[PDB]
Ligand binder design. Structure first.
Ligand code: MG
Ligand code: MG
Ligand code: MG
Ligand code: MG
Ligand code: MG
Ligand code: MG
Ligand code: MG
Ligand code: MG
Ligand code: MG
Ligand code: MG
Ligand code: MG
Ligand code: MG
Ligand code: MG
Ligand code: MG
Ligand code: MG
Ligand code: MG
Ligand code: MG
Ligand code: MG
Ligand code: MG
Ligand code: MG
Ligand code: MG
Ligand code: MG
Ligand code: MG
Ligand code: MG
Ligand code: MG
Ligand code: MG
Ligand code: MG
Ligand code: MG
Ligand code: MG
Ligand code: MG
Ligand code: MG
Ligand code: MG
Ligand code: MG
Ligand code: MG
Ligand code: MG
Ligand code: MG
Ligand code: MG
Ligand code: MG
Ligand code: MG
Ligand code: MG
Ligand code: MG
Ligand code: MG
Ligand code: MG
Ligand code: MG
Ligand code: MG
Ligand code: MG
Ligand code: MG
Ligand code: MG
Ligand code: MG
Ligand code: MG
Ligand code: MG
Ligand code: MG
Ligand code: MG
Ligand code: MG
Ligand code: MG
Ligand code: MG
Ligand code: MG
Ligand code: MG
Ligand code: MG
Ligand code: MG
Ligand code: MG
Ligand code: MG
Ligand code: MG
Ligand code: MG
Ligand code: MG
Ligand code: MG
Lengths: 62, 77, 94, 46, 103
RNA sequence: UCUAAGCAUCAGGUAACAUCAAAUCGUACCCCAAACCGACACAGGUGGUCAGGUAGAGAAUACCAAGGCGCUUGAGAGAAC
RNA sequence: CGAAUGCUGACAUAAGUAACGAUAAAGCGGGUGAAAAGCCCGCUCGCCGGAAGACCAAGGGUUCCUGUCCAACGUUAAUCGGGGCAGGGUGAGUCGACCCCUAAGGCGAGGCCGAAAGGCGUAGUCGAUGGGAAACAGGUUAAUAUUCCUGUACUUGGUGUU
RNA sequence: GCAGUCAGAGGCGAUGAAGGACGUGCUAAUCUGCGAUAAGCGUCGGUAAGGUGAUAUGAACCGUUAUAACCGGCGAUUUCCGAAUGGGGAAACCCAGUGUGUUUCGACACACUAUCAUUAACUGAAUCCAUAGGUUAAUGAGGCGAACCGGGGGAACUGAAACAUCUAAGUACCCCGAGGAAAAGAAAUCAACCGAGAUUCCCCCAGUAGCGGCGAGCGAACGGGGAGCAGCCCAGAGCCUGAAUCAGUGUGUGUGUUAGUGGAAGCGUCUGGAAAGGCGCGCGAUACAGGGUGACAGCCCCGUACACAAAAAUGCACAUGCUGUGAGCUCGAUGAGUAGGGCGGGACACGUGGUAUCCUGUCUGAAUAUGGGGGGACCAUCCUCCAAGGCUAAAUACUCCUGACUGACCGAUAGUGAACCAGUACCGUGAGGGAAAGGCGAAAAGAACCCCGGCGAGGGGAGUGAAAAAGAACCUGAAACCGUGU
């Protein structure tokens, strides 16, 4: 979604980077117990942190 | 080291040939002394570790001419 | 104030065990699985935010990994860090 | 009976360790030999 | 790059099952297709307590080389081969016999 | 504890009270030993600490307390050596 | 290739012979089990007791504790184990290290010295085996405790007051 | 693995290396990959129906006409240790200072701070001017890596049938500094009365002339044939003024490089587990290089000869704008503690000899174009040359690495030590030493089910397969060695 997140701001991709990490915390605790039978969701959020961290450095002086 | 500071002489190596022509390794050291030179333009003394062949060069060229060569060499005094 | 991005990395899992269960029903203690470079002031600051529950004191220890054998080949498990977070009175946790 | 190997980790490390093998011209050539040979454990140091 | 694909109808050229037409079911990365119905072998399947299999002597499909089949031509009724040309600026495939496009 | 540069109506000093903080690492188990040093589940080697009773000069010695052990092939027979 | 007290692997012989590692010592009943001289429980007997008990440092590095397994390992059998496999277990302002300070000694800006590499050394900076703040009693786990809990304390710092 | 041929590339590093430590998965370990954005992120191209690295199944998912996955260009992110560079240290650890922004006052984040060198400004002792010194700045260096290269030091065993001169040998080894090559290089060089015209390298000359306890040994030049070719500047004033050459930056423009694209032509019968084989009848070839496919394939598959391709970054070339450097004429200068010499050694094929020439530790010391060097002791004549200042391409040397192709090279006790998770296990305090171990089958179709046994080990059936004395202790299955039967 780096095509789509490019139509955002540094104000948003600090809020957007902060909601994936809330989401990542609730997936890791859910997979700690036997309560996550969708383990394709750990990989999706971790790959989407990287797209937002990339767009923060493209904006900040690149 | 045993290095003359104007000429650049240095210990060199050779043999002690005996009467039966046995060769053992020796060195040849340079005739180094230390000496204060009065420099008239700067109005001070300069100590240099210089050979007796090098004290004879300053007799010929002059102390101002010699010290210019050691600055352009990059050597400190 | 520790940044909100550091508080979301300090906690890893809850530790499940008989000793970990006993302190929850006796000493009001949750036993967590934390990061290895976490510190007692961050273990206190991430339970008091992400779980919304007050903490009295934190007791940490580092657990060392075991040497196992994959048939003929030797290998070792990683070390990890283990916290005993003491809750306050009337403080129940999801 | 007392045998020749009496271990001590501090004296293990001061005499044969990585920071000892870097403090001299010859000790650095011991490490350059063991890198071109292909040693997995390069020093005494854990 | 590939000639034989997922749901082609092939015809086997060598083996114990030479000559039988049939639909391909998948293609593996080792250069081997598993074709539906053809290369049937019997495996003495071992039952397990979990996973809910009764376990017996199951007959199932075994992987045959891609080189050992060929795309059956429906119009001629024979084994024919596959070429690569470009139509509409897109890559297509056609039969080496009669030069007509696979569609 | 004493002052000097400095600072002088600020610091700083020190008596009470209130308050916050004390991080990080080690911590199991053996340790005169079957876990350390001796190729061995090897009668060998290995620094400190604690020191009950009766007899006794005694931390010797004999028998015991607390505590710990019977030493990882046994069964017979009852010759020479 | 038949030989070099040749080189490597396999396999004989002696020979089912010597040996099974302190002469501190065992007996029986019950249990478990496919199987019990050796494991568990019970009762007796013997040995240590300035150690063959208990607590550490150094060194080791999970041998700890529990469940399961007996191929190999254990000088015999093994249901047992410091063996195999899986899980659990080490909680500190006061204990120790770190940190502060120095000894012997080490390194050492410049410096002086030396074919090169290098040597010694001033200012300094490291280096304990020595100096420098403070917690006790009781209770609790299968396995940690001066650390957990109960009772009762003490110590050094930042802040704000008057 | 080993030996080569042809062509690239000839470095990497403070923009943090080589080599590591620790992390990183739906993951318990190890391997490869990656670095807290952690088997990966963006972008630009290639390509696509199949994918999510290995042992190695499973689970949870993504994708099919284009941001699934893969391949390449340029980017992003890149923990800790290591020259490690803020201080220290028992590598992967321990402790900060300063400045800047936030702070629910408990505290967080980011940046900077080694040393040396040169340069610059501010300052600044004895001591008046000064100067040593002091403090900030900018720029550079440092470490590692195969051989080749140049220089500073430099053995002994051995041979001499002993051994000391001599040999081995300026070899082995240690150290400093480079570069893609280095070094050398434009005659104070040879020749011989005729002439050649810098250096390097190959072949002759030639085991020659000589040197040599005249022993063992060491060993040229002159001249000839080739490879390759190249000549210039400064010790300096006028006239000309940006014209000769070289690099740098740029740009157009070729040619490579780094992903790729199409690529011909065969069937019937026999044996067989299985046809590529046999036997018939055909077709392709600018492609019968090679490899795979259930036995031996030009025509089943991958390719091969041939024909096309690049958004982007880049190498060697051309052309063009460009800063600096200056051509050409003109008169003039012509490298002094230097050449030679005495003494002690070293180099020359030449061991001090009748020994020319070169270098210099020591002591001395010219002439200067009317002058000086060499022509193998030395002298006269004649000839040739101009030292004491620099620069310079090609031919020559080498391979850690890259790619393609080859072998009267090896085939597992061989070839690397290592075909296999090998510089590993293991041994040593350390430096260092250092293994063994390859093959089921075409495909796991890897033996459901029943039986003896301890819910054992192991075996007997059954079934799979062409084969089960191919059953994982697996192709073949020799000998020693040990048994049962006659
Ligand atoms: Mg000699
Ligand atoms: Mg507490
Ligand atoms: Mg702790
Ligand atoms: Mg303890
Ligand atoms: Mg004891
Ligand atoms: Mg024993
Ligand atoms: Mg013993
Ligand atoms: Mg008797
Ligand atoms: Mg033989
Ligand atoms: Mg013979
Ligand atoms: Mg023999
Ligand atoms: Mg026998
Ligand atoms: Mg017997
Ligand atoms: Mg006998
Ligand atoms: Mg006997
Ligand atoms: Mg006997
Ligand atoms: Mg006995
Ligand atoms: Mg015994
Ligand atoms: Mg009994
Ligand atoms: Mg017994
Ligand atoms: Mg008993
Ligand atoms: Mg006694
Ligand atoms: Mg173990
Ligand atoms: Mg135990
Ligand atoms: Mg157990
Ligand atoms: Mg048994
Ligand atoms: Mg046994
Ligand atoms: Mg055990
Ligand atoms: Mg203390
Ligand atoms: Mg020193
Ligand atoms: Mg110095
Ligand atoms: Mg000191
Ligand atoms: Mg100190
Ligand atoms: Mg101490
Ligand atoms: Mg102390
Ligand atoms: Mg205990
Ligand atoms: Mg996969
Ligand atoms: Mg340092
Ligand atoms: Mg540092
Ligand atoms: Mg320090
Ligand atoms: Mg000799
Ligand atoms: Mg000799
Ligand atoms: Mg001799
Ligand atoms: Mg050059
Ligand atoms: Mg001439
Ligand atoms: Mg193609
Ligand atoms: Mg083709
Ligand atoms: Mg085929
Ligand atoms: Mg065959
Ligand atoms: Mg001159
Ligand atoms: Mg001379
Ligand atoms: Mg002379
Ligand atoms: Mg002489
Ligand atoms: Mg002279
Ligand atoms: Mg001359
Ligand atoms: Mg003559
Ligand atoms: Mg001259
Ligand atoms: Mg010249
Ligand atoms: Mg081999
Ligand atoms: Mg073989
Ligand atoms: Mg070998
Ligand atoms: Mg070892
Ligand atoms: Mg069985
Ligand atoms: Mg075969
Ligand atoms: Mg066999
Ligand atoms: Mg045999």
């Amino acid at each position: 979604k780096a095509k789509e997140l490019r139509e955002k701001s540094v104000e948003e991709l600090n809020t957007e980077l902060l909601n994936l990490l809330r989401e990542q915390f609730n997936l890791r605790m859910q997979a700690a117990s036997g309560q996550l039978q969708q383990s394709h969701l750990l990989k999706q959020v971790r790959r989407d942190v990287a797209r937002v961290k990339t767009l923060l450095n493209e904006k900040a002086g690149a | 080291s045993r290095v003359c500071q104007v000429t650049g002489k240095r210990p060199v190596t050779g043999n002690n040939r005996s009467h039966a022509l046995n060769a053992t390794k020796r060195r040849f050291l340079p005739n180094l002394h230390s000496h204060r030179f009065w420099v008239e333009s700067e109005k001070r003394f300069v100590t240099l570790r210089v050979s007796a062949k090098g004290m004879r060069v300053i007799d010929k060229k002059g102390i101002d001419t010699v010290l210019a060569e050691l600055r352009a060499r990059g050597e400190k005094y | 104030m520790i940044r909100e991005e550091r508080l979301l990395k300090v906690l890893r899992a809850p530790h499940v065990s008989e000793k970990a269960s006993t302190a929850m029903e006796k000493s009001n203690t949750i036993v967590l699985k934390v990061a290895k470079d976490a510190t007692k002031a961050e273990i206190k600051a991430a339970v008091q935010k992400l779980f919304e529950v007050e903490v009295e004191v934190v007791n940490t220890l580092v657990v060392k990994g075991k040497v196992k054998r994959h048939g003929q080949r030797i290998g070792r498990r990683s070390d990890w860090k283990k916290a005993y977070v003491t809750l306050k009175e009337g403080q129940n946790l999801d | 009976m007392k045998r020749t190997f009496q271990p001590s980790v501090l004296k293990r490390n001061r005499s044969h360790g990585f920071r000892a093998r870097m403090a001299t011209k010859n000790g650095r050539q011991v490490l350059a030999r063991r890198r071109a040979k292909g040693r997995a454990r390069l020093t005494v140091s854990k | 790059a590939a000639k034989i694909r997922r749901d082609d109808e092939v015809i086997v050229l060598t083996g114990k099952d030479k000559g039988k037409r049939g639909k391909v079911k998948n293609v593996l990365s080792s250069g081997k297709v598993i074709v539906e119905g053809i290369n049937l072998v019997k495996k003495h399947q071992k039952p397990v307590p979990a996973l809910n299999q009764p376990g017996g002597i199951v007959e199932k499909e075994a992987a045959i080389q891609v080189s050992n089949v060929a795309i059956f031509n429906a119009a001629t009724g024979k084994a024919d081969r596959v070429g690569f040309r470009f139509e509409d600026g897109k890559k297509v495939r056609f039969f080496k016999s009669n030069s007509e496009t696979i569609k």
